[PDB]
């Protein structure tokens, strides 16, 4: 839906009912650990300041306003414009160090008509270089995820560093963690989509790093709050010193988090996940170290893509070698009920399933954790209704309404008709999804995730549905031996 | 084929006839701008040295040999093993700075049983925002070429190399300079293409795993290892993953003949595949320091990512362009009158759709041309040949090969793309492309460029998959405008 006006333009209260619609990109204020100016793209006339900017740079409130950047930044003003040519993206950032009244770090980016400048204080090197090689030589996605979080924590000294991976449905999961000895084990925890809303996700896809240095600090407004050019909200979406959403700063406080920081991992223009960081006390990470994190953000964006592709390939291999061992016994031997229900074949483990139903020559027969006998009959009745020679679902209760009661033993379904109709068929079953534990916050969020996944099960990997289809073909080929 | 033994084990001469089989990974020697040691994976006993190593570190020839790394590197020896656990890949590299008799930069990697250590002098250099800004520039570049320019430009600004080129491989393993950044007053290599054999198999393969190698002085003498063989196995010490590995003699010739004193190249890898190189040249010898090489290595991988992004974005907007064009064709196809009138209209630009030099149309028994097309009697003979072919779609980069008797009509129409509108090839439509041609600006590039053109004799610009895809979708939609004409 269309986001509401900001609080400073008669906008409504950002409650937990409508926070999907917070204009997080135009808070009209910054964090107090730095300063911020805006200026005309062409003229270089300074138009807005953060109130602290006067004190932070070492000049006076209305002497800066209505002044050329040519004057303020004689060395940088020309080189700045070379780096940020008119009409360039807002994602593009030029950086430089300065001398005043101390050493400052200037970070500039352009929002079409308006230049936006961020000032904050500034000032062995093989930590990154070695980590780069470590990431690359890690054997799988988990191992990569561990090296990432471990490294980031070693570099930053954050209390908690987690790699937070998004799922198809926009829900999150902590797949690796690195924390200080004596802390909550967030590893494994999953959280709903709404905990990181649309506009937040969208913004994190273009601008790949944002932080909250002090979760208790007061925001520093811009003066004037609006851009004199257009009389419009100044978009700070691509500014590191942008004021964090009040609603989120609550979440952080309730976790006892003083400082936060997150780095986007993007794969194929898609927000794959975050390196989320926490400190229980406020902590301003210096610009040169943030830069080091930014490199990892993108080195990881690459290796994530490589390792997932390598992992799926070796997983696909495993299913194909398994599929062969099945077809070996299928051409061979005797009745299928005898052969396929053999533990040596492990026909369950093929589709990492909790239960398995087989019907052959009119008889049905089970293996593993399967619903009560009368229900199994009613299920095979329902299967005969369905078109095609393949069915699947993460939550059977939804697709088969009258089979909602048999969710605990068999929430997930994967079915294949061997011959025609569903007379000769084969059916896998998965339990209702279940995870362990270790209002506003994670304890409530974790519970509301489990509520959303009520009656749902572990979803089927495409390669499992693909190999299941190839098994329909090869197992049809061992019916003339039995007919 | 199986590579020959190295020169130092009675191996044959690496001539230009058999250089595909040079064991480039085991030269048994290093470059003189650094030093090199090998040691036991478990014990840390030093087994081999480069002859200069004694002088370079500040100890004596046979005092180092048969010594623990625990003694030599008390601070590093433990942390080293933590970073390089037994059985880890040879691609994995641990780095650290030292103090002796000066500041050294140690770079270690493991080849299973054997640890290999590289020493070379170091420093802080340059300030640090050059990379950080370049990272953002690459990302915000609008297309592959623009990205390529920013890369080469940046690399040159950082290194001060005389020439920096982004060298992109093609499907057939041939190369092409797609961007260049050189010093004012130099050979314009931009555009030049070179054959596959100029960078052979084992070279390519090695450059896919170890993503950077250099030649600091093209005239310098190699420094051998003593002993040349590994005492463990009595085997060639593989230096493939060592920066100070001695460059192939055969390649150092190539560089000398171009007047290149120093070379350096960084692999760009996309999907486990060697996409291309950032190739650098200096006309005088030039040792690039380790901390600056590291900066180049980051770009090597930032670029590996953006190349993949920008190519995917470029193909997507190109695919869009063909689809909007395809629509404008089908708009006039349902409409109007005879197809010969409609399709041969310049406003439609049925040529430009498939970026073709010539175009043949046949409809209701008559054939009709547009643009640069072979002589009339040949066109008849071509349509005869087309009727032989199965399916409703033909393609080729070099028609002369697939249609032997049509080899003579290569200059006007080397490339072919055909689609039968109805059935058979009675009602059909055929695009033609000229023989591939590029401009100019023994052993070296001048000969290589010419031998590339020789290999591409009778060949044409190949058809983008999306052009062959949209051509197939045009068969369907244009069949749908035949009941209007029948
Ligand atoms: C209904 C609105 C809600 C609010 C929305 C919201 N959230 C963010 C930014 C983040 N929210 C996150 C959620 C988590 N962080 C964690 O550490 C954990 C568990 C350990 C969870 C579930 C995260 C990770 C971020 C990233 C930012 C950061 O880590 O510092 C925003 C936008 C913040 C901004 O950029 O200004 C918004 C609007 N959060 C909710 O949970 C609901 C109630
Ligand atoms: C028959 C053997 C040949 C020899 C093979 C060869 N080449 C290399 C390394 C390279 N060769 C390259 C060829 C070019 N470099 C250029 O700059 C241009 C045009 C401007 C061409 C055509 C390139 C780019 C490399 C990369 C290395 C580098 O740039 O420094 C090796 C192995 C080198 C090593 O790592 O030891 C070998 C064996 N070159 C030939 O042309 C043929 C005759």
Swiss-Prot record, chain A:
GO process annotations (BP): detection of visible light; osmosensory signaling via phosphorelay pathway; regulation of DNA-templated transcription
Cystine pairings recorded for this chain: none
Transmembrane segments: none
Effect seen on changing residue 277 to A: Binds PCB (in vitro), but has aberrant spectral properties
Post-translational modification: Contains one covalently linked tetrapyrrole chromophore. Lacks the cysteine conserved in plant phytochromes (at the position of Met-247) that binds chromophore. An engineered sequence used for X-ray crystallography forms a thioether link to biliverdin through Cys-19. The natural sequence can bind phycocyanobilin and phytochromobilin in vitro, but the identity of the natural chromophore is unknown.
Native source organism of the sequence: Deinococcus radiodurans (strain ATCC 13939 / DSM 20539 / JCM 16871 / CCUG 27074 / LMG 4051 / NBRC 15346 / NCIMB 9279 / VKM B-1422 / R1)
Chromophore binding domain as annotated region, ranges: 90-479
Keyword field: ATP-binding, Chromophore, Kinase, Nucleotide-binding, Phosphoprotein, Photoreceptor protein, Receptor, Sensory transduction, Transferase
Family in the record: In the N-terminal section; belongs to the phytochrome family.
Ligand binding (a tetrapyrrole): 19
Highest classification ranks of the organism: Bacteria, Thermotogati, Deinococcota, Deinococci, Deinococcales
Name this protein carries in UniProt: Bacteriophytochrome
Coiled coil stretches, renumbered: none
Catalytic reaction annotation: ATP + protein L-histidine = ADP + protein N-phospho-L-histidine
GO molecular function: ATP binding; identical protein binding; phosphorelay response regulator activity; phosphorelay sensor kinase activity; photoreceptor activity; protein kinase activator activity
Function, in words: Photoreceptor which exists in two forms that are reversibly interconvertible by light: the R form that absorbs maximally in the red region of the spectrum and the FR form that absorbs maximally in the far-red region. Also has a slight blue shift for the far-red maximum. Could also absorb green light. May participate in regulating pigment synthesis like the carotenoid deinoxanthin which could protect the bacterium from intense visible light.
UniProtKB/Swiss-Prot annotation, chain B:
Consequence of changing residue 250 to C: Binds PCB (in vitro), but difference spectrum is altered
Gene: bphP
Binding site for a tetrapyrrole: 19
Keyword field: ATP-binding, Chromophore, Kinase, Nucleotide-binding, Phosphoprotein, Photoreceptor protein, Receptor, Sensory transduction, Transferase
Organism per entry: Deinococcus radiodurans (strain ATCC 13939 / DSM 20539 / JCM 16871 / CCUG 27074 / LMG 4051 / NBRC 15346 / NCIMB 9279 / VKM B-1422 / R1)
GO MF term set: ATP binding; identical protein binding; phosphorelay response regulator activity; phosphorelay sensor kinase activity; photoreceptor activity; protein kinase activator activity
Domain named PAS: residues: 21-89
Post-translational modification (record): Contains one covalently linked tetrapyrrole chromophore. Lacks the cysteine conserved in plant phytochromes (at the position of Met-250) that binds chromophore. An engineered sequence used for X-ray crystallography forms a thioether link to biliverdin through Cys-19. The natural sequence can bind phycocyanobilin and phytochromobilin in vitro, but the identity of the natural chromophore is unknown.
Phenotypic consequence of residue 280 to A: Binds PCB (in vitro), but has aberrant spectral properties
Listed name of the protein: Bacteriophytochrome
Region called Chromophore binding domain, residue ranges: 90-482
Biological process according to GO: detection of visible light; osmosensory signaling via phosphorelay pathway; regulation of DNA-templated transcription
Family, per entry: In the N-terminal section; belongs to the phytochrome family.
Full-protein positions shown: 6 to 502 of 755
Protein purpose: Photoreceptor which exists in two forms that are reversibly interconvertible by light: the R form that absorbs maximally in the red region of the spectrum and the FR form that absorbs maximally in the far-red region. Also has a slight blue shift for the far-red maximum. Could also absorb green light. May participate in regulating pigment synthesis like the carotenoid deinoxanthin which could protect the bacterium from intense visible light.
Domain GAF stretches: 143-307
The EC number(s) this enzyme carries: 2.7.13.3
Substrates-to-products reaction catalysed: ATP + protein L-histidine = ADP + protein N-phospho-L-histidine
């Amino acid at each position: 839906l269309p986001f509401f006006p900001p609080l400073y333009l008669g906008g409504p209260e950002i409650t937990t009912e409508n926070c999907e619609r917070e204009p997080i990109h135009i808070p009209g204020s910054i964090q107090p650990h730095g300063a911020l100016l805006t200026a005309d793209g062409h003229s270089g006339e300074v138009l807005q300041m953060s109130l602290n900017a006067a004190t932070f740079l070492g000049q006076e409130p209305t002497v800066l306003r209505g002044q050329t950047l040519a004057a303020l930044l004689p060395e940088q003003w020309p080189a700045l414009q070379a780096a940020l040519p008119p009409g360039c993206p807002d994602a593009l950032q030029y950086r430089a160090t300065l001398d005043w009244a101390g050493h400052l770090s200037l970070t500039v980016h352009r929002v079409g008509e308006l230049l936006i400048l961020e000032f904050e204080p500034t000032e062995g090197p093989h930590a990154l270089r070695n980590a780069m090689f470590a990431l690359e030589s890690a054997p799988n996605l988990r191992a990569l995820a561990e090296v990432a979080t471990q490294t980031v924590r070693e570099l930053t000294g954050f209390d908690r560093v987690m790699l937070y991976k998004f799922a198809p449905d926009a829900t999150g999961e902590v797949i690796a963690e690195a924390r200080r000895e004596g802390l909550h084990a967030f590893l494994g925890h999953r959280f709903p989509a709404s905990d990181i809303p649309a506009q937040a996700r969208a913004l994190y896809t273009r601008h790949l790093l944002r932080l909250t240095a002090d979760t208790r600090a007061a925001a520093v407004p811009l003066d004037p709050v609006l851009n004199p050019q257009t009389n419009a909200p100044t978009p700070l979406g691509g500014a590191v010193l942008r004021a964090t959403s009040p609603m989120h700063m609550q979440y952080l406080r309730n976790m006892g988090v003083g400082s936060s920081l997150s780095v986007s991992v993007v794969v194929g223009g898609q927000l794959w996940g975050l390196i989320a960081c926490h400190h229980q006390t406020p902590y301003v990470l210096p610009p040169d170290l943030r830069t080091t994190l930014e490199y990892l953000g993108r080195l990881l964006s690459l290796q994530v893509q490589v390792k997932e592709a390598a992992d799926v390939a070796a997983f696909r291999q495993s299913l194909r070698e398994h599929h062969a061992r099945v077809a070996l016994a299928a051409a061979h031997s005797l009745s299928p009920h005898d052969t396929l229900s053999d533990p040596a074949l492990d026909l369950l483990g093929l589709m990492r399933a909790g239960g398995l139903i087989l019907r052959f020559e009119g008889r049905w027969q089970t293996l593993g954790e399967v619903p009560p006998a009368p229900a199994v009959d009613a299920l095979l009745a329902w299967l005969e209704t369905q078109p095609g020679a393949l069915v699947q679902t993460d939550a059977l209760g939804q697709l088969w309404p009258a089979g909602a009661d048999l969710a605990p033993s068999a929430a997930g379904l994967l079915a294949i008709s061997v011959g025609e109709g569903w007379s000769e068929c084969l059916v896998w079953l998965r339990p209702e999804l279940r995870l362990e534990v270790a209002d506003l916050g994670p304890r409530h969020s974790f519970d509301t995730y489990l509520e959303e996944k009520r009656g749902y099960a572990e979803p089927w990997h495409p390669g499992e549905i693909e190999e299941a289809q190839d098994l329909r073909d090869t197992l049809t080929g061992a019916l003339e031996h039995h007919h």
